[PDB]
Amino acid sequence: QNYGINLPITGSMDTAYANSTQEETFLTSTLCLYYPTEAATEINDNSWKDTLSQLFLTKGWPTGSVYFKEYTDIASFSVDPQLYCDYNVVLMKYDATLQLDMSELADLILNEWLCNPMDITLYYYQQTDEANKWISMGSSCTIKVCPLNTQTLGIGCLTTDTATFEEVATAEKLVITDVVDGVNHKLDVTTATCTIRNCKKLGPRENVAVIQVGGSDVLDITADPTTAPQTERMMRINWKKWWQVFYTVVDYVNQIIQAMSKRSR
Amino acid sequence: QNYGINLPITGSMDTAYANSTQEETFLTSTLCLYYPTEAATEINDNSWKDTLSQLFLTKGWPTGSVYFKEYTDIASFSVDPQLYCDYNVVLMKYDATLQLDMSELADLILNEWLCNPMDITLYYYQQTDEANKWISMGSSCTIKVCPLNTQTLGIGCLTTDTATFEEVATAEKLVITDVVDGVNHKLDVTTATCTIRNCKKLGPRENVAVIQVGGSDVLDITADPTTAPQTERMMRINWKKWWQVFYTVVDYVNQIIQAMSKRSR
Amino acid sequence: INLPITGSMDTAYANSTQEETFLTSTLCLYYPTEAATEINDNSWKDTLSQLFLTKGWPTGSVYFKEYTDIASFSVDPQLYCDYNVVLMKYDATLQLDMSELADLILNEWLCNPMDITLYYYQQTDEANKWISMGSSCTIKVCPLNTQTLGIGCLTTDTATFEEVATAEKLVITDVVDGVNHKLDVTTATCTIRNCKKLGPRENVAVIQVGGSDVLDITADPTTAPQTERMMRINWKKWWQVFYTVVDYVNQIIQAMSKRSRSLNSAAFYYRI
Amino acid sequence: INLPITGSMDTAYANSTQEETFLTSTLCLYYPTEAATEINDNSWKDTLSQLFLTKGWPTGSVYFKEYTDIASFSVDPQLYCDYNVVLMKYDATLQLDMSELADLILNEWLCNPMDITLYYYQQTDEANKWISMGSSCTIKVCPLNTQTLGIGCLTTDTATFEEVATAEKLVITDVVDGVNHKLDVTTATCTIRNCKKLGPRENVAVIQVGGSDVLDITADPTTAPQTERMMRINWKKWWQVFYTVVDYVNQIIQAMSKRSRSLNSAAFYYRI
Amino acid sequence: ASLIYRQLLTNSYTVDLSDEIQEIGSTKTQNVTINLGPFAQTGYAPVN
Amino acid sequence: MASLIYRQLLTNSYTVDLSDEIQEIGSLWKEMQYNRDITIRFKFASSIVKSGGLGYKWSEISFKPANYQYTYTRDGEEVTAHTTCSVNGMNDFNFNGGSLPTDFVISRYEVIKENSYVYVDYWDDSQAFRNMVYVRSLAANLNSVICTGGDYSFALPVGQWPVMTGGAVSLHSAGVTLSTQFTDFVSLNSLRFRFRLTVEEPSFSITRTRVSRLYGLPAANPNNGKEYYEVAGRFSLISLVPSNDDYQTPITNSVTVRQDLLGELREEFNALSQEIAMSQLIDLALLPLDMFSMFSGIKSTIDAAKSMATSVMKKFKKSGLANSVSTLTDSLSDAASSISRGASIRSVGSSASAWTDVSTQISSISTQTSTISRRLRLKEMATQTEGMNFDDISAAVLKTKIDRSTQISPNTLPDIVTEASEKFIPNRAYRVINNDEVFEAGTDGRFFAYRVETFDEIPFDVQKFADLVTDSPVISAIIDFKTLKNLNDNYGISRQQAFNLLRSDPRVLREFINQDNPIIRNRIEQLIMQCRL
Ligand SMILES: *[C@@H]1O[C@H](CO)[C@@H](O)[C@H](O)[C@H]1NC(C)=O
Ligand SMILES: *[C@@H]1O[C@H](CO)[C@@H](O)[C@H](O)[C@H]1NC(C)=O
Ligand SMILES: *[C@@H]1O[C@H](CO)[C@@H](O)[C@H](O)[C@H]1NC(C)=O
Ligand SMILES: *[C@@H]1O[C@H](CO)[C@@H](O)[C@H](O)[C@H]1NC(C)=O
Ligand SMILES: *[C@@H]1O[C@H](CO)[C@@H](O)[C@H](O)[C@H]1NC(C)=O
Ligand SMILES: [Ca+2]
Ligand SMILES: [Ca+2]
Ligand SMILES: [Ca+2]
Ligand SMILES: [Ca+2]
Ligand SMILES: [Ca+2]
Ligand SMILES: [Ca+2]
Ligand SMILES: [Ca+2]
Ligand SMILES: [Ca+2]
Ligand SMILES: [Ca+2]
Ligand SMILES: [Ca+2]
Ligand SMILES: [Ca+2]
Ligand SMILES: [Ca+2]
Question: Which residue ranges are recorded for the region named Spike foot (chain F) (predicted)?
Answer without folding.
Answer: 274-533
